[model samples]
Target: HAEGTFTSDVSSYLEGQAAKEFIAWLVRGRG
Candidate 1:
């Protein structure tokens, strides 16, 4: 149970990081 929770947390964190990277890429592409 604890492992599952940790895995979910990591997944969420990675998704957020990916989103930030994607947004940064788009901003750079536009400019």
Candidate 2:
């Protein structure tokens, strides 16, 4: 019953931004 309430919404947003930011940081560290 919590499909379109809060959990899904927050999870989607965090997943995209968090993933992108993490990848960029990793590349910078290697260089």
Which one wins on TM-score? 1
Q: CA lDDT of each candidate?
A: 0.73, 0.75
The Cα RMSD in angstroms, rounded to one decimal, for candidate 2 relative to the true structure is: 4.7
RMSD of 1: 4.5
Tens-place lDDT per residue, model 2, 1-31, is: 5446776777788667756778888798987
Please provide, for model 1 over 1-31, each residue's C-alpha lDDT reduced to its tens digit, 9 standing for 90 to 100: 3445676677778668756778988798987
Deviating ranges (above 4 Å) for candidate 1: 1-15
* Candidate 2: residue pairs that collide: none
Q: Which candidate achieves the best lDDT against the true structure? A: 2
What TM-score does each of the candidates earn? 0.32, 0.29
